[PDB]
From Swiss-Prot, chains A, B:
Native organism taxonomy: Bacteria, Pseudomonadati, Pseudomonadota, Alphaproteobacteria, Rhodobacterales
Pfam families reported in the protein's UniProt record: Lyase_aromatic (PF00221)
Species of origin: Cereibacter sphaeroides (strain ATCC 17023 / DSM 158 / JCM 6121 / CCUG 31486 / LMG 2827 / NBRC 12203 / NCIMB 8253 / ATH 2.4.1.)
Record family assignment: Belongs to the PAL/histidase family.
Active site, UniProt feature: Y54 (proton donor/acceptor)
Ligand binding (substrate): H83, R294, N423, A424, A425, N426, Q427
Keyword presence, Lyase: yes
Protein name as annotated: Tyrosine ammonia-lyase
Modifications after synthesis and translation: Contains an active site 4-methylidene-imidazol-5-one (MIO), which is formed autocatalytically by cyclization and dehydration of residues Ala-Ser-Gly.
Resulting phenotype, H83F: Abolishes tyrosine ammonia-lyase activity. Increases affinity for L-Phe. Increases the low intrinsic phenylalanine ammonia-lyase activity about twentyfold
Oligomer and partners: Homotetramer.
PROSITE patterns, A to Z: PAL_HISTIDASE (PS00488)
Length: 514, 514, 513
């Protein structure tokens, strides 16, 4: 009975992704419909009164100094969509493109965009369908270009994408999705080509993916402890209280929960032990684990606090009106002209999250490096191989692949610092927020692949250490390994792992270990 | 018919690309065939004598301390390919994958790899067919992973690609291309899974693309001068002689040739003018052009010298034996163990070329920014629009798109500086040359799109300035615009340019303006 | 003191000798004659009132304002004034002098119009023990630093003594026996022009890299003597199979360093014939980890990058990067173009910076391996002496090396950051000066990492072979003994920061010979 998200004023990130991913239908609440009808009328009055407004009585960009007569507005807005459709590059994926449509709709729902009922209906119809507009990913400096392409698609003059990414031409899309062609006769084109919808859509998908990968990062760190006799005192709540960062407190708590019931971890607090004369000397192992285990709360915690900041800012952006111009619902003035379309907030938060993702991917990569090293994995086979050593190398190749993926992630930095004056110097500063969000997404995809490798390594390591029965392994750990084994067989002998790594990565981005 | 490249010892970059792109067939010269048969015999002896050799009687990586009985070599080498096949990500394009196969073949042709006649024939057959192995682009730290995937493909256990990128399953590929399944019964698997073949293949394709884009960069700078009354004295040979960088001298000479016959450029040497009291005052324009024209020889020249270095190093790498172990043709020792597989040379040259490409793309982007700015383009319409201003914005969107593409290029830096110790610390330093070459390729693709936008802008600007008949435009300039107009119509009214930009970019990467 | 006679061409070594004060500089008669001829040409250009940038026009976009001859002195005086907006730490003594030299070499070609007096001022500075105090930041690539240089030479700017101590303008002219710069001939553009700053910085970088490269080779070799490294990986036969010049050179130099050593493994593993009884797991693998086995390939790629950098820099140093320029053949009164665009030094500096970071990474991993008790084949953890635990040896220094490398990696190429400026007239800029400076910082970090590796190796060699260094090559023995003359063995933990810093300063100026 497909769930339904009723949009009034505010929608959270989970609800937004539910709609964007097609897991939920979207309906406009009565008060939203009324606010929008009132705004539609205000746009009508602005046109009727011949108010000096950008896009209604003026050209675009530096050409806004050219005033336009009412009889040429249809042509004015038609060419607006035309000159902006200069995008190139691979199309945004199905979910992301739909997230963009949703972002524009949420802004419009605030009742300050002047969008007609039909226009709103076209956006709602798309979201309730199984399709997404096919829009090029590159072209914007932060999001008129991708939105212009969206408009063309909705008019049947651009391709559509099905859940699998297969492309349909304009006519087929409108047909298969039972959609009506977009009509901009009300001169409300600026309600569709405006704001930060693309970067916001991309970022909300990033937020969802990071939540799941963060759960896997925690789950795998915990399982790693069960495979290497990790010490749980480093994850004690007392330490969190002494350094009260919310993300760290949460990370530690989640780690403790994962290993609850485990007989494979070391829970003894070393300071409890009293030493005598015969103890002085060299012990087989130090009283503390390497940082990839001991400092997991602190590293994961910092990443989680970054994601929390990213989500706070993104939630405001998603539910805001980033349009220009805007028509004040209070009727104070006919319209306001400013720069709420400047996507600097998503640009900076996306860049910050990208750095955090790279840091956490580094943690996972080092956890793989330690687990597969016979000199560091406390008795486990080199590279967790099965069968005769040498004749079999196990995950030796996959371990290097994880390193290669991480190295590539590091080569790309923040997008925000590259602003270049453009548009005849009119846009002398630009956010590049769309690019920032896209670069962050690529890093998230690499992180998923690294975590997938770590997951496959841990499933094997758990069985090598505790037997196929996973004796002593926590209930959470057992459930995770058993769940993986349902689709990924043990590595009893070397075999190509590339397709399995890719398949598992796709899963990690959409579901958590529960 | 079809040109033929006879491989003996040395092959230049153009020949290599000719074979990789399918433009030429390949044949092994008799002397090379004999050197390889001799090497094939040496491998046989080494195996019979049970010599201590990596991959023949030992495990891989840190597992090399595990000696292997001769009776298990077939299994040892089969699992080598298996554990290495952990690659992920989009497959290398048709031409690039074939360039990788060619790179491995050229190394083998030197006669120190021990490859059997059948093995060599399988590589030659692939290169002479219309197919390419479908290999994932990510996974190597620099190139066992991509080569292992290549081996699987050649055995019919992996997909193939046709010229269009459409995939064929293993069986279908061997069938269609009349290829025999790869047989490694001679224990010469290390002849196929070794060296720097992938990064070298990617780099040779990069080299070819840059040659063409460099020609377009020159041709478009020249046409820009014809559209903005550019001063040719800045491109004088006398200036080149004073600062003798080969690349600069070449760039200047090529620019002068492009505008030969033009009546649209300013050829007067300002210093010839004798001033008198009546001349003292403010003139309409300065006596020298802005840097995007005046310093073109110096900027383009520096990029050309970088490409020259890249090509010198790449030519040595392509024709070298990057195998390990190796079997000395002189027979001094049974085999040598070293590290000629370390791709640091291609890593550093690819990173250097990537920077040069970003710099030249910046030049093109600023040329677009100047040409489309009504305050800087000396009388041309804002954004080169046609039709009523305001109602039409011309290339206003495309100009911003060019800026967005450049900003994205700048976000990615050198890959070489991210070495991370891996393989249980055995590979404590890695080149990341494959990643370096791939990142350079992405920048080259962005540069092509920026140049495409500049070309479309210039075709329009030339007609706006000189009329549809291009009165006064140089013969070379006329030919370039006429050729563009054969496929790309004038912008009489605003229209979506995205698909045209993408289409032209594909052309620029493969052909030069002549 | 040796003398470098400048006529037309000077190599990088000669340039550094003069910049560092190791050699005097003299302008050869042919150069003096060419320069006098150019001085005469400038005089004629001025007399004839030819339309020339800086002589009859304003600057930058203001060049459209033509100037009357009677106002040229003010014109050129204000040129220096508006350009002196530099900020930041001053260039070091050697680098500032290298900049002065680069401008002089350009002038020596005879196309700048510089007067005999102006040339003498540059020569005098180079023959003195002083350097102009010029801010390092401000140029987009090198009018700003050169304008500051002019002010200094006129006694209106500070000078630096060899130690970096600053002297005011008046004191500088007095102590260095320098006459104040007089630009009455209207030859100011002969001094404020070209790519002199980035070129001077780059030539100092080139010299430093040659020495650090020699240390990288020497320490890799000593590392092999401390870890029983296998020399077959450095065989000439392998170089011939993959003929990169830098690699062949690196391998040959490595072999030379360990010649006479009894601590390395020279056996070719493939010589060994295996028996059924040998099948199993041996104590060690037949090949070394990459930090030793792939040294020729890694060092070699770095050396080939430096070779390219040096080829390009040699052309730049000996070129005329001035604008405008006065053709010696008299074909035209003057040429106007853009030879001041420092894109060549920008791109080569960025490429070298990447290579330096890669090589520093190699040294850092060599330290990480040598100090790891699980990887150093029997050596004490962190090469400590005295009771373990109570002593940690080089544990702190090892982490410091990692920290230095991580910092190097945070900074990338400077060339990709061009920004349209000067009212869009300078719509593309090279940033070559910044590129060269960022490369210098990386070189300084590399020196520190190598210093740590050197101190670790001196200790490791003594721990492995005894204080007498038994079995160690003559080259290795000489290196360790030289280090021990100033750096005592670590018998008990002690602060190493100042020693690391002191040794790093040495590595940048001298090689292990």
């Amino acid at each position: 009975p497909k769930p339904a998200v009723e949009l009034d004023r505010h929608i959270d990130l989970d609800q937004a992704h539910a709609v964007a991913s097609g897991g939920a239908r979207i309906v406009l609440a009565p008060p939203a419909r009324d606010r929008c009808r009132a705004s539609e009328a205000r746009l009508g009055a602005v046109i009727r009164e011949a108010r000096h407004v950008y896009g209604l009585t003026t050209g675009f960009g530096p050409l806004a100094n050219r005033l336009i007569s009412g009889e040429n507005v249809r042509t004015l807005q038609a060419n607006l969509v035309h000159h902006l459709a200069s995008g190139v590059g691979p199309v945004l994926d199905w979910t992301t493109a739909r997230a963009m449509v949703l972002a524009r709709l949420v802004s419009i729902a605030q009742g300050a965009s002047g969008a007609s009922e039909g226009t709103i209906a076209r956006l709602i119809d798309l979201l309730n369908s199984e399709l997404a507009p096919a829009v090029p990913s590159r072209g914007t400096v932060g999001d008129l270009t991708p939105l212009a392409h969206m408009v063309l698609c909705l008019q049947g003059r651009g391709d559509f994408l099905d859940r699998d990414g297969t492309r349909l031409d304009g006519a087929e899309g409108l047909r298969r999705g039972r959609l009506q062609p977009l009509d901009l006769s009300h001169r409300d084109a600026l309600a569709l080509v405006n704001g930060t919808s693309a970067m916001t859509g991309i970022a909300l998908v990033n937020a969802h993916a990071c939540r799941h990968l963060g759960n896997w990062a925690v789950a795998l760190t915990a399982l790693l402890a069960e495979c290497l006799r990790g010490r749980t005192e480093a994850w004690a709540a007392a330490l969190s209280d002494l350094r009260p960062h919310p993300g760290q407190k949460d990370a530690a708590a989640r780690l403790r929960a994962r290993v609850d019931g485990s007989a494979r971890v070391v829970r003894h607090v070393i300071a409890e032990r009293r030493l005598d004369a015969g103890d002085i000397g060299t012990e087989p192992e130090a009283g503390q684990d390497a940082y990839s285990l001991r400092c997991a709360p602190q590293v994961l915690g910092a990443g989680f606090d970054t994601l929390a900041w990213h989500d706070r800012v993104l939630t405001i952006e998603l539910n805001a009106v980033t349009d220009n111009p805007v028509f004040p619902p209070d009727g104070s003035v006919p319209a306001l002209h400013g720069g709420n379309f400047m996507g600097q907030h998503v640009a900076l938060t996306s860049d910050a999250l990208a750095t955090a993702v790279t840091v956490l991917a580094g943690l996972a990569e080092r956890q793989i490096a330690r687990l597969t090293d016979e000199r560091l994995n406390r008795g486990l086979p080199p590279f967790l191989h099965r069968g005769p050593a040498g004749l079999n190398s196990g995950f030796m190749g996959a371990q290097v692949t994880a390193t290669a993926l991480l190295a590539e992630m590091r080569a790309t930095g923040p997008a925000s610092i590259h602003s270049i004056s453009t548009n005849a110097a009119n846009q002398d500063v630009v956010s590049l927020g769309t690019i920032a969000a896209r670069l962050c997404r690529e890093k998230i995809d690499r992180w998923a692949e690294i975590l997938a490798i770590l997951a496959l390594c841990l499933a094997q390591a758990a069985e090598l250490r505790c037997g196929s029965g996973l004796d002593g392994v926590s209930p959470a750990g057992k459930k995770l390994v058993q769940a993986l084994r349902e689709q990924f067989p043990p590595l009893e002998t070397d075999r190509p792992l590339g397709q399995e790594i890719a398949a598992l990565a796709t899963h990690l981005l959409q579901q958590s270990p529960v």
